[PDB]
Structures are given as C-alpha cells and as structure tokens.
Symmetry: D2
Subunit: 336 residues, 4 copies
C-alpha cells in the first residue's frame, strides 16, 4: 500500500535531540527511529531502552554508511552540522538539520554547493517557528494584507533565569537571535542591510571576560528601509520570553506579547496572574512536532518544504554581523 | 455673575462620608462644604481642621433648620436616611442621599410621598456606578444597540478579605448587591420578578449564628424572562471585585472582568501580574466625584439627574426578596 | 515485544465520530482503527478511503461479534449508548463511550450492573475536559490546596451562533451542560443537591414551541452548601465560549475567562483584538487526543482511568433535574 | 486664612493650551485663570466667554508686565518657550512651561542661567508622564528595588493615524520622543551616551521631501551600558500608543502594554476586543491635572517639584542627537 515508513537516524541526544528522538519514535506518522549516533554511551543506552532504537553508532559516518535509514536528523553541536549534512547527502539520505546551518560563511557555501548537487534529496533546517500555530496565524494575516506593508518588526528571545547558572557558545546573537532573524526574513521577504548591537552583563559580569552577554539589543535596517529591533537575553525572571511584534501600515500584531502558559487565570493576593511557559520544549512543543511531520511528509510526497540552505546562510551571516557590531560597538553592513 | 455656589451640609463622617466631604470641599466646582453633622465629636473636629467647615452640628434637624446651606449630603447609617431625607426636604433643602434609600418598604413609600410634594427640590440617590466611566461606556454600547437585546446580566460585588476581621448590617444582599440590582434595572429598563438566593459561610462559620453571610449567589428572572445572576461576598483574596457582564443577542461585554488597578503589567517569577484595585474608594473614585458634581450641577441648572426614589424602592425590595429567598431557601416573588 | 496494538471499532461517524476515528487511525500510539459501523453508506466509504478501515458494518452487534477488535469507541446518538455499551462488554470488548452515558435513569442503572459484571474490561466516558491541559492545571492548583476549599463554581458552555440555523436534542442542559456538571463533581468531590433553572428564547423564539432553549441559566446548591452557577447557550457571537471559574477561600481562578484562539494579539481600528476559538474541535483538540490515548494506555497497562458509570449517571441525573426545574420553573431536588 | 489663590496667565490656546486653561479655570484648587495671551483673536474671545478670563493680551510681555498674575503657563510653539520663560522670570512670575524647554542648545543654556538667577521662583517643565498614576506606580516598584537594576528600557510613542492628514515640526524625535527620553532619565537616573536612529515614510512618502518621518526607531546606549529602545510614529491604526517597558535584573514591567481605554471588554464576531484610548488628552487627562495642581501647590508651599531646566536641556539634546543620527544614518554621541 502507498507511502510506507521513513526510517530515520538521529545524531545528537542532548535535550533537543531527545525531544526530536522521542517525537519521531512515538508521535510522528509514517516514521521509525531506526538509528542513533552519540559519543556518549549513556545516551545510546537511553535510545535503546526508552525508544527501542535498533541500531546505535558512535560515529555519524558509520551510521549513514551502514544503518537501514532513509533520512537523518542532525541535532549535534553547531560545528558539526555542515560536515554531517554533506556526509548524509553523499550517502543518499534526506536531511533535517537543526539551526544554525553552520558557523563559517565559506564552509556554509561549500555545503550549499553539495546540497545543490543533491536536489532529489530533501534538505530542511529546523526553523521551527515557521511551524508554530501562532506564528502561522500571524503570517496568514500578513499574507492576506491585513496589516498592510510591514514597517517594523520587534522580536525578543529571552531564556529563563533558571538556565543562567549552568550557562555561566558562539555568542548571544547566534545562540538566541537566529530564529528571530529568520522570522524577520520570512515575514518580510526582505534582507537585512546593516545593524548595530549593544549589550551588557549587569546581572552576571562574569560573562564579560568569558566573552559572552546576558542581555543584548540591536537595531537593524532592512533593504527597503524596513526597521527591525532585537532583544536577546538569558535572564528572564518570568520564564521563556519569545515574542514577535509586527507593525504594518494598516495595523499591528504581537505573537505572545506575554508567554501565556495556558488558558488559566489565577486571582490571589498578588493580583491577577497568568502563569507563563517556562522553557522552549514547553513553548514550542507543537512546532517541533509539526516540523518533524512536515519533513517526513516532504519525503513521502516528494515536495520541498521551503526552508533552504540560503535561509540558513542568511541567518548565520546576520548573527555574525550583530556579533561584530557588538564587539566593535559600531554599525556593521551584513553583506560585508 | 450667573450660577453661584451651592452650600452643602453633610451628615455622616464615616469612611464614605469623609470621601464625599473631602471631595465637596476641595474638588467639586461651584460648591462649598458649609456644615457637617455627627454624633462623634472627633469627626466634627476633623471637619473643622481638615476641611475648614464653618458650622458643626450634633443633630441633623438642627443643621437643616439653622445652617447656611442649600443642600444636604446624607451619608448616615441606612436606618436614618428616610427621616433625614424628609427633614431636609421639609426645610427646603436639595437632597443627595446614599443608598439604600431606606430599609422598610412602608417607610420608604412614606418618603416617596414627601419627595413628590417637593418636586422643585432635587433628590438624588448615590448609585455611583451610573457615573462610572466604564459603566457609562457599556451603557452607551447597549443604548446604541451594539449587543442587541440583553438576555442575561451577571454581576459580582465581592469585598476584599482585608475587611473580614472587622466585619466579624442588614444582610449580605442589602449590603453588597444593591448597586448590582440598580445596574440591572438601569441597563435593561426591566423589573425583577422572582429570585432564589443561596449562601455559605465556608471561610468564616462564625457568621452563621450572627445571621450573616460571607459569600452568596442568586439567580433572578426578570419580567420578560431576562435572566440575572448575582454573586456577593466579603472575602475576595485579590482585592475589590466588582464586575458586570452583559450578554446580548448580538454580543457580550464585561465591565472589569478583572479589577485592573492601572495600566501596569508586572512580569516576574510568579508569571504575568496585573495589580488590582483594593477597595471601593480606589475603584470608584471617579464615579464619586462625577455623581457629586452632577448633583451640584442639577441644582444650578434646575435639571433632574434621573435617579429617583423609585430606583431606591426597587433596589431595597429586590434585596429584601433575595434575603427572604436565602432564609427560606426557596424562590421568592419580589412583588410579594 | 511487550504491549502490542489495540484494534478499535468505532460506531458513529458524525462530526465528533470522525474526529475520534481520524485521531485513532493517524495519531494515537499503539492503536489501529480496524472497524467502523454506520447506517450511512457514505460514512463507511469515507472510513475506507480516508482512513483505510478494513472492516465496515451496518450493524453494531455485527461489528462487535465478528470484527477483529479489542475495544470499541461509541460515538452514536445518545439513545444508543447504553445498548451498545452492554453489547460490547458482553462480547468481551473494552469500551469508550461518549457522554451522556444514557438518557433514562432506570436504563442507566441496568447498564451500571452490566459494567460491574465485566470489571476486567475498561469502561471510560468521554468527559474530555478532564484531559484538557488548562483544566488539569487548575485541578492541580486545587488539589495542592492553593485556593483552599471551593465555595463556588461558575461554568459556561455557549455554542457559536454559527450553529443556530441548523439547530433550528434532549434539552439545552443535557446537550450543553453535562460537561459542566462533571467538572463541578470532579473539582469538588461533592454532589449536587437542588437546582433552579430558567431560560429564554430571545434571539430565536421558534425554539419555544420546539421545546428547546437558546440560552439558559441555573443556580445549584451542593451537599455542603457549595454553590454552583451554570449558563448554557447556543448563540455566542464571539465563538465557542467554554469557561469555568472556581472561587475558593484563599483565591480564585478562571479557565478560559475568554476563549483565546492562540498567542496572537491584533491591534487595529477596532482596538486590541484577541481572536477566539470557534468550535469544540478546535478548543478541545488536545483533550480529545489525550483521552483517546489514555483509553488505549489503560487497556495496555491494565489500569483504570477513573471516569466511571457513576460519573455518567450523576451527569445525566443533574441535567434531567435542571430540565425539570426549567419546565416547572421551580427548585428541584436532584435525588428525587 | 493661610494660602490664598494663585492667579495664572496662560499663553498658547491651541489644543493643549485650551486643556490647561480649562483645567486651571475649573478644576485646579487654589488657582484662578486670570489672564490669557494669544495672537488669534478668536482664542481670546473663547477664553473670555468659556472661562471668564478677565484680562486678555495680544502680547506675552504685555501680559507679564501688566496682568494681575503670580504665575504663567507657557503653552506657545516651542520656538517661543525660552524667551517667554526669561521674560516671566524677570517680571517676578513663577513659570510652568511645556516641553521642550527650547530648540537651540546655546539658547537653552542662556535660559538656564536666567533660571539660576531666580531661584526663589518656581520653574517646572511639562513632563506630565511623571505625574501619571501608572508611571508613578512603576516608578515606585523600581525605587523599592522590585525589578533590581534596570538593564533596558523600551518606549513607544505613536500618534493615531487620525492625525496624519493634517500632519501632512522640528522632527519626529523632538516631537514624539522627548517624553520618552525624560522617562528614561527619570527611571534610571542615568544619562544617554550614544544613539543610532532610522526611519521610514512607508505609508506616507510625501514626508521624505518635507524632511519628516512617519515612523522611526532608535537604539541608545546609556552611561553604564544600560540599553534603551525608542519607537516614534504618527500612524497608529489602533489609537494613541504610548507604552514603556522596563527590564530589570529581577523582573520586568510594562506601562500600557496596550493602551486600554477603560475596564470594558467587548466580545463579538471579531473576537475579544479591548477599546483603546484615542489621543493624548484622553490618555493623559489625569497627568495634566496632577502636574497643574503640583505647580500651584509648589508655589503655595514653597517646595520645588524636581523637574528642572537640566531635564529640559538633556531632553532636547538627546532628541537632536537622534535627529542627527537619522540624517547621517550613523551613530551619534549625545555629548558632541
């Protein structure tokens, strides 16, 4: 009977890897988590015991050469994405890769070429916000012309204070802002021209010498003089604050003005309380499932999803520009 | 020059009396707080020292007979309203009276007659919600036909838990619900036919034997089979909860769905917080000022405000019906 | 390998039946939609074509006698639930049944006996709100003692005006309020003693003669003098309004104070807009999936879910009491 | 009897001037609107007829030399503020001046000297947001240490689209952002070091050649590397959007996240609607009254309010810096 099962091998079983692994194994239609790769033995025992993964590997190339798989999910550290993407494509496997695509512009361009040489194989980057129901609803309003042309986008990505102690990386803007950059490109269809970024380690000055930032902000000018504002942070007291505001000529919208946990309002001595989502797995649970299913369906239906290596390239380049602008404390042109 | 100063004498310098007194003396245009009556000497010294009241009295009839006043504000305990209303009108004074108009239906009707015999004098009852900006905005929407005919009104009046200790009266529904009854009559233009009320002293069972209630609820059927729901209480943990919901054939609205204090949203470890108004003087500050100014302006302009003794009568009767329904634990017809 | 696949046969392929069918076939782990029963041929072709159901039946007893199934999902009209429950249990099948369990108290008690005689088989009623994330969050707060003892519950179930034209049944309270009754019992652990219900057909008087109601309201007194308020309706202009408020001695909460569609806020000429969920499949999508998975898992793990025939009985009895109270326009004791 | 009446002369009877005039004449305690100056005769007839102003003048120096006044309210166009401030102080009058203090840094410094030479006379600038109840509530939380040290402030001032047609000035940031600059200085106690501003005329390109901007955005770095973000605009579809967000080390708050008009929520076919405040007189009505009363009380009580010429100077300088940064499309240091 038509359209069978896509067998997937995963690499990277950190927090996010385990979410994708668990989802593929137990929720995603027409998919099997067949293989897993990790350099941490305990992670491979987990894959076998919890998810019943049949083939475990210590090495990614070993998995892609030998495992009974049609596709891979790449959830390794960012420095490994490009080489693993190329290897999987060269072994005839469809590829889902987490963001960022890579860290080095030249290396990324090498991978773009490899991808272009395997056009029959699916390649999808994990910009999961494109699959989130609220982002999609806003995108629809924008596409329908309901707020007119976009004049400004403000996007915030602030991690919960709960993560600061362990955090004390590639930089604040690469870590926190790449989804925001992609959202800006997605909604506008436009590119970013120049940026200025500033930052502070006011709560945790230890990050000064570690090179890092606890909170940063940026102003960006787009190609048609569209404006964008970013805030990125690692120290939100109220939970996981990911919010995107779009201002248009005819209206305005905000996606998660505040990060409401659910439909429950609590009233007590502190006033009126809306509990908040606390972390990315909670906030983006639906989006992760949707992007995984889209990847599997793309293979079965031979239809591209629309999230390209170019989207990856531009994401990384803008983030590098923000980083450079922060270090120089000056305006930087992205194309340079 | 046209339209001079209305000199007012006040009786009752409890919490609410002091608010009206302070407002008349310091905020209200074309008004002077000329006289004050109280059986508490400290209250009269307060009136003299804080507000510069020129004439103090221990007795209301003495004030109305002898003070240089055009009008009175009656803010005494409810059992004194009727006799003070009659005395003031018989002495040629315009009358503002706090709710309730009185407690006894027969006695109230006696006062309605006295009022009818002094039609040249203004008489206004302190149903301040009619002057509140939010209530007025909703009233306007209703009057303009924006929600169609009203099918149901739900109104809550819940005092803050901060007041329970002192509270441990005339009954819960007379105390808390008379404004709600008036709001229902005001918005609908309709009368209440029969009611059932229940109640509980779950947080403070001491009120069982004291006759009182800490929380009560009621269902009411209006003359055209319009529905109304009341909740009254003395134990709100989040502040002063006064909320009115109107459901119509074309739409629905809520006045203070939650009692927002101001425009400030706070985000911290507890989630997203909206601080709340804490007590009636805070919530209804604007309404008190507006009704006081309306009273003064009515006298200067010789124009009736529209809040009549009949509005007072029906308020008290419906509240008595709710009380009776609670005590009998059965449906009571208001007209009986 | 441990714990295989639960094969399910479904009866009833109306709107809700098709949701359960689609979910079981495509989303639920360890489940197969093996069989379907319907008296509408087009529905059986749908089951075969859309979901690949292998065995179709025109008759429920034929399905339960002959299909290769372990369990049934009963989503037929309410008058068929009891007989189909008994038949499935007598044929050794685990049973999920939609609410209400049945319509006749005596007939329901007959089925309770049959259920008691098949204790090895799972029986679960579709009170899906118990599986909804927001309801569960509130339940947790209540269970943890965060609002103290419950003094009052107000619950609204109002269907969108979009459905009125087709609607123009068993009565308004049986149709709309049974989930609310169950929620009240679930949160409190208490039973309902007596009720009064009123109603109106103000937008659609045609329902007067049809016996029906477009909007109704009720006050209920529980066994410990806990209070409850219901509103049920078929004419909400803003979408699907299902809201539950719980007032406790230490706090208060509302589940879906307003029925927010998602995390998107829109700002335009009309003010600040939150779009709303429009219908039950949208609002309770997660809850339906969760209750279906719970049913399958209960069978695999041999662990009862906790939603009993008694919960069904009490749901129907309270709804009948509300109906009787409405028709008599008087207080009715549920136990009578 | 102690503390008499402050007689005030006003200049400028545009929209804002008429608000101050009306307030002083009819609401403010211990104040009389004695005199008015305007070069528009109709405005002087208005002052006489509507407010009963006794002395009208065509010339400001004539008013301050000859009118029976103790103080002035300067609500003329911005280019006249400095010369009118100096004249009033030299004639022994207390001075309230609207923002901005002036437009030219050198000229402003000349006026600062004149002010320093009249220390016995009150001087207050109309930064009314400092008197707004919501801003004051947030200020209190910040002062009490509740959000810790401030890491970022984002402030938006967007005028309603209703004003665009007439608007089609001194620049967008001087017009719209001076209150935001002052708010940033007020809350932080810190100064602004360097800025970058960008802008667009996407809805109304006619403003390109007129020199103006319809929407602009800015990033600012403060002296301790505190961050600030501004958005200024003239084309808000939803009303008057003035919002200030403060992010601290321990928490976050927003003042008017959305510009709620009142406590009324409306539910209809468009979803859940909160109507919005439409213009500055509506939004800041309370603040205008409070700052006027503070000015009068400062004179009566001989106590400075705390809003100085320096606050004015820094407001104008930062706005000029934003303007320069926009024109050059580069980072500008405020102190240069």
């Amino acid at each position: 009977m038509t359209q069978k099962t896509i067998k997937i091998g995963i690499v990277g079983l950190g927090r996010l890897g385990k979410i994708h692994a668990t989802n593929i194994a137990t929720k995603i239609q027409h998919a099997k988590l067949q293989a897993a790769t990790s350099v941490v033995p305990a992670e491979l025992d987990w894959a076998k015991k919890e998810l019943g993964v049949e083939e475990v590997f210590e090495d990614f190339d070993d998995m892609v050469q030998h495992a009974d798989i049609d596709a891979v999910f790449i959830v390794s550290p960012s420095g490994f994405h490009l080489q693993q993407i190329e290897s999987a494509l060269n072994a005839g496997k469809h590829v889902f890769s987490e963001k960022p695509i890579g860290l080095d512009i030249e290396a990324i361009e090498h991978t773009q070429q490899v991808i272009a040489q395997h056009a029959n194989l699916k390649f999808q980057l994990g910009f999961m916000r494109r699959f989130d129901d609220s982002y999609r609803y806003a995108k629809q309003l924008v596409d329908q012309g309901k707020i007119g042309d976009i004049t400004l986008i403000r996007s915030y990505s602030i991690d919960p204070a709960a993560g600061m102690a362990s955090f004390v990386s590639g930089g604040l803007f690469l870590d926190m802002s790449i989804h925001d950059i992609d959202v800006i490109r997605w909604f506008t269809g436009k590119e970013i021209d120049k940026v200025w970024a500033i930052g502070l380690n006011r709560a945790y000055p230890v990050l000064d010498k570690a090179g890092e930032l606890e909170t940063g902000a940026a102003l960006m000018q787009l190609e048609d003089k569209t404006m964008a504002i970013l805030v990125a942070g690692r120290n939100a007291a109220h939970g996981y604050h990911v919010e995107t505001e779009i201002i248009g000529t005819k209206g305005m919208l905000r996606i998660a003005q505040v990060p409401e946990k659910n439909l429950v309002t609590v009233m007590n001595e502190e006033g009126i309380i809306r509990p908040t989502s606390q972390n990315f797995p909670e906030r983006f649970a639906q989006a992760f499932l949707s992007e995984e299913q889209a990847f599997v369906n793309s293979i079965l239906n031979n239809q591209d999803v629309g999230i390209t290596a170019e989207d990856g390239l531009q994401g990384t380049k803008a983030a590098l520009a923000l980083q450079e602008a922060f270090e120089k404390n000056d305006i930087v042109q992205v194309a340079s």
